[PDB]
Each structure stands twice: as structure tokens, then as C-alpha cells.
Design an enzyme around this catalytic site. Sequence first.
Site, PDB file in Angstrom:
ATOM      1  N   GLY A 297      -8.556   2.428   5.601  1.00  0.00           N
ATOM      2  CA  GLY A 297      -9.784   2.109   6.301  1.00  0.00           C
ATOM      3  C   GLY A 297     -10.082   3.210   7.297  1.00  0.00           C
TER       4      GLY A 297
ATOM      5  N   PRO B 255      -6.047   5.758   2.236  1.00  0.00           N
ATOM      6  CA  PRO B 255      -7.201   5.214   2.969  1.00  0.00           C
ATOM      7  C   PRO B 255      -7.093   3.737   3.376  1.00  0.00           C
ATOM      8  CG  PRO B 255      -7.664   5.250   0.627  1.00  0.00           C
ATOM      9  CD  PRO B 255      -6.337   5.941   0.800  1.00  0.00           C
TER      10      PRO B 255
ATOM     11  N   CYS C  86       0.795  -1.225   0.000  1.00  0.00           N
ATOM     12  CA  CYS C  86       0.000   0.000   0.000  1.00  0.00           C
ATOM     13  C   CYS C  86       0.838   1.292   0.000  1.00  0.00           C
ATOM     14  CB  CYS C  86      -1.001   0.015   1.169  1.00  0.00           C
ATOM     15  SG  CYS C  86      -2.199  -1.383   1.226  1.00  0.00           S
TER      16      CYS C  86
ATOM     17  N   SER D 259      -5.254  -0.591  -2.474  1.00  0.00           N
ATOM     18  CA  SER D 259      -3.839  -0.709  -2.117  1.00  0.00           C
ATOM     19  C   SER D 259      -3.002   0.445  -2.687  1.00  0.00           C
ATOM     20  CB  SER D 259      -3.276  -2.069  -2.540  1.00  0.00           C
ATOM     21  OG  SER D 259      -1.985  -2.288  -1.995  1.00  0.00           O
TER      22      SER D 259
ATOM     23  N   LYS E  37     -10.631   3.703  10.514  1.00  0.00           N
ATOM     24  CA  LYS E  37      -9.926   3.925  11.773  1.00  0.00           C
ATOM     25  C   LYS E  37      -8.530   4.476  11.541  1.00  0.00           C
ATOM     26  CE  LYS E  37     -13.391   1.066  13.109  1.00  0.00           C
ATOM     27  NZ  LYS E  37     -14.288   0.185  12.290  1.00  0.00           N
TER      28      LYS E  37
ATOM     29  N   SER F 220      -9.045 -11.180  10.103  1.00  0.00           N
ATOM     30  CA  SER F 220      -8.114 -10.388   9.348  1.00  0.00           C
ATOM     31  C   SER F 220      -8.530 -10.372   7.882  1.00  0.00           C
ATOM     32  CB  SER F 220      -6.715 -10.942   9.525  1.00  0.00           C
ATOM     33  OG  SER F 220      -5.794  -9.892   9.609  1.00  0.00           O
TER      34      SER F 220
END
EC number: 2.3.1.-
Lengths: 353, 352
Positions: free
Chosen positions: A280, A278, A138, A312, A282, A180
Site C-alpha cells: 500500500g 506493495p 505477503c 499478497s 504508505k 482494518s
Amino acid sequence: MSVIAGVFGALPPHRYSQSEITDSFVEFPGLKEHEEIIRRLHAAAKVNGRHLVLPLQQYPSLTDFGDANEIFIEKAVDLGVEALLGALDDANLRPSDIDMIATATVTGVAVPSLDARIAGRLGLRPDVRRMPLFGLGCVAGAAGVARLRDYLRGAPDDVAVLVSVELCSLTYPAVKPTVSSLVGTALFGDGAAAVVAVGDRRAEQVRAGGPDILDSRSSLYPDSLHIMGWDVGSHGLRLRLSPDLTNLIERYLANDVTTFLDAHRLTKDDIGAWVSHPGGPKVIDAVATSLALPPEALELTWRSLGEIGNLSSASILHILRDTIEKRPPSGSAGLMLAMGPGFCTELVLLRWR
Amino acid sequence: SVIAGVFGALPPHRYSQSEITDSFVEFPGLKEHEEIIRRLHAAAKVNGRHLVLPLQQYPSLTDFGDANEIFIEKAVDLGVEALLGALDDANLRPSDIDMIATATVTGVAVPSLDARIAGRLGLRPDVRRMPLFGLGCVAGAAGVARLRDYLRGAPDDVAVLVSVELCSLTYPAVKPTVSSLVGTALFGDGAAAVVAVGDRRAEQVRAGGPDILDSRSSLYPDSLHIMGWDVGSHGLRLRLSPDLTNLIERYLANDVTTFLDAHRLTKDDIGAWVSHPGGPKVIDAVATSLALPPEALELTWRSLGEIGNLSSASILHILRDTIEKRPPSGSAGLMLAMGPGFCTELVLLRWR
């Protein structure tokens, strides 16, 4: 110290809503028993859509790593030359022009690599220089731009390109209903991106438009190899993702962006454009939090997350284009910030003009 | 950009070719192929190899998940060993390093080995990482070429390349086929490291390896099929073509001739040829297409003999071999390699 001339993002023609992806996903063999966590997780992602490389009902039948990786090779290539062409045309340039080509994937393995293949398909010069960047993940969006600059720094008549193509869907063969992987099935989508950068000297002749890549800085956090990456086995590429990741961000990311900016007599208040990756919700909240940032700032990233998912290493390029599109205000500065397996970070200083 | 340190690293275990073959024919199934393997193993002209694992352990290595797991373990240890060795040669510390580039093709790690190396050595947390996979055996010449490309935009910096190849560990994907049997006769395990330094930093550090003056890459049209990995459930399956040598015989002379003419040199101006040892038939093709007497290639021949074909690492063992032979000053040198692509990389060196 050189200047982007074109950015382009491509993505599979099949867009599916998130509820459609979920409604169907729960009905997958051996999954219905985990409906509850799946629904909650897919709803927790703040992802409204995702392009997928295959029809949605075909994944249940995708279970051999051997099959999925051949699909990858066939499929990554074509999104890439689509993304490269889009950028080369954004940059008013042609394949003959390209002196180096960097390739970034972490989502299938290919040897000979993608760049060779995309080199074959686009007719790039036989002596094009090839930089196939694997195992960066990423962060290769920001890292890929960096190695670009590092290359043009000492070659100012030149043309260098970065193609990012990540097809997360095709890692399905190794997805089991554990937290996960499921976090994974909630966020990740398929997509491609390309950036065409050029020398300062070359910049004036083909009238580059993107901002310049002024500086970069990697930051490899110690004792943290486990935070993410792949467990790799007969079943494909198994997503390893730890919850400890948001913790590391909050406790060190402030320090990094402070040392990188200071070395340019600058504070976090001068950067008039952020391009953030990004991972995610959080993660995007932790970074907003650590850097003491108002929501106006990371708005293109949440909107990219809602619209295409987490792509990614291609996302940051998609967002990069999103903000380029919205022409900031001439002179202003900007800051790519990506993170990925390492655990590591990457900041790219950018100036618009 | 100029070379400062070169060092090769091996796993403790060594085994002669005959000792390897004698055990290898035992392995299950494999005894009914005893003729060809014996044929193939003898004609590899490889006398010994360093296997990262004990010999009678492979037959049990059938899972690609297990192999890749062990790869990651032995691969960093071995790469640190190398980087440390080249770093000492240079009289430089791990903390002087500004860029690290990594060549492996034989195991899939994310995070890359270079991250796992950068941690084991305490390289600066802001060191630039450039993992490369999979360039193939071209990756020693091609990596040295990215180094130049890096340092040439940064003359005060210190860059390194570390290549680590553990071919025995792809073994969960070998079957009784001519092309997987070939590779079984050829490829060994090992690693190597090159530290190069930028211009403005070369005097200040006593840089003794060769200056690097340029490289040329050459991707052949419609040639994917010639060299690569069949990736899948049993791991990394070698795919090698017999048509190979007839690509070399075809387009190699024109590759180097074109490169040299850019520098207004002739093949006769090169005195020391640095060549990748992809086994006997490939090396003849190279001697043949460029007309180099048995003198120009002798260090590679011997390397293929003592050490085996160690994929992207061999060319750096030979580059070290030739340097300790220490060429006339100012004379000039050519690195030549070929990997998946199918492709060619040429590196013009200038000894010091």
C-alpha cells in the site's frame, strides 16, 4: 546459489475498475452507511484496477466461510496450473522435469494442499517433493524464492518451482465495515504467480535466463506478532492489520538492508534493480523513505499496484516478471524485498545474467 | 545431515481410553450413539491419551473460533517445550539454530507457530522459517526429509523441525458420523522435535542420532478424496476413507521396493522399521503388504497404545522410542508415513 528460468503471472479474467469496485461495493448490504470512509479509503490506495475471481455482484451473497473456501480450492488450483504452465513454457521445460514444488497461500485453507492438487493436474512426477508454505503471507514471494535456492544449492542438476496463488476476494465472508477490513477491501485483489528455478549445472543445459538467486536473509522483528495476520473464526479469515506497521519499517529496514548488503561488500547504490512488495502507498513511501531512494527505483511497484492491486505473495513475482521483462544491464545486481506476518522481512539478493 | 536430538512432549493431563469413552458418550446428542462409539473406541487399541484440555470441558467447546484461539495458546508452549527438549539432547542452544520448520495440521495460525516459537526462544532474527501445513501425519517423515534437503545445501548449519498436533481441539467439527467418530477413538494431543545437523558440523558437535541418507515421496494419482480436512464454519472436519487400506495393500510394497532398489537394499537389510500408527487396520495393512513379522513394528503398536495417534507427531515419538533402543551400529532403518494427498513418504536412516 541458482538461477531462475521462468516467471509467469496469471489473474482472473474479470478486471474491474476501482471506481466500479467502489460504486458497487458501497451498495452492498450493510455498507452504504460507511460510504464516506469507503470512498476515501478506496481512493487512498492508488489502485486503479483489480481482477476478481467472481463477478462483483456475487460477493454480497458470499457469506459462508464453508462456501468461499470450496470456491477457493476449485479456483486457486486452476490459476496455479495456469501460472505453472506459463512459467514451465517460459523455462522451456515440462512437468516431468520438476523435482520439487513449493506452494504459497495464506488466503484459504486446503488439505490435501494446493501442491498435491496442482501435482495431480499437471502430471508432475509422483516423487516430486512438496513444500506447501502456509502462514507466511505477503512475504512468501521473496521467502518462496529463498527456500527454492536453499534447495538447489545442494542439488545443482535440479528443477524447483514456486507457485503463489492468492484469492483475497474469497475472504469476504469475514469482512465487516471496520477500518482494518476496509483498508483490506481497498487494496487486495486476486492473482497467481509461478517461478521456475534450476541448478547452476542444470542452468547451462536448458539455458536459463532469469537472474541468479545469490543469497537471502530473513529478519523477524520481535514483540510484533499482532502487527498483521488473521483472526480465524467461524466467519472465515479476518484481516488483522495494524497502523504501527509503517513505524517498524522506518526504524529497522535501513539496518537490515545494510547488514545484508555489507556481507557482499556492497552499498545500496550498487543494486541496479529493486523488486519491492506493495503493501500500500504508505508502506511503499516508508520504504522509499527509509532507504533514501529516488522514485525511478520503485516505479514498477507503484505501476503494479495501480494495475492489479495488492496480490499478497503473488505481487512481488508479478513485479519480478515486470522488471525481468525490462532487461537491466548485464552484471548489475538486484534486490527482492518483501514483508508480511511475523512481523518479518525477507531480502533476496539477485544477479542478472 | 544427521540427527542430533529427538524429544517428545505431552500435556500434563492423561486419561485412559475407557475413562475418555465413558465421559464421551455423555456429551449432548451423543448418548443415542452409545453403541457404536463404544464399539469404535474399544477397537482403536488405544489405551490412553493426553488431551490438552480437561475432559468435561470439550462438550462446551462448540465454536471453531474459540478452539483455534486455544490451539494457538497451547500449541506454542508445547512446541517450545519440545524444541527445548531436543535442543538439550543435542547439547545445542536455541541461538545455534539456522532453520526452523513447522508441522501442524490441526489449527490455523498466521503468523505461523514457528514465528511464535522463534520469538519465545530467542532464535536468531535471521533464522529461516519453513512452515508447512498441511502435510498431515506424513509430516514427521516428510519434515525430517526437508531437513536433510536443507542441511545438504548447508553442511555447517543446524536445522530443526517441530511438529505440534492438538487433535482434540478440532472437536467443534465432530458430528455423529462414522469417520468423525473414528477419529474420536484414535487421535490424541502432543508434540515432538527433531534437531539435525549438517555434515561439516556433525563431528564438531558429537551428533549421535542417525545419519539421513535419502527420502522418497509418493503421490498417488487421483486420490485427493482419501484423507483431508473439510474446512468450514464449524472448523476442521475429518474426512477419512475406508478405501484407504486398499490403497496401501495396492501400492505400498511397490513404493518401498522401488526406494530400496535405488539403494540396492532389500526389506531384509532394514533393522528398524519406523512406522506411523494410524490405528490397527492400517498397521496390519503395512505388516501385510511388506511382510514384516510382529517384531518389526512393535514400537509403533505400543505407541498407538500408550499415546494414541498424534497425527504428524507420532512418528517422531516412535523414532525416539526406537533410538533409545539404540540399534546395532551401521545397521539401517526406514521411516514410513502416509498423509493427505493421498501420499507416502519414506525416509532411509543409518544408525550411529
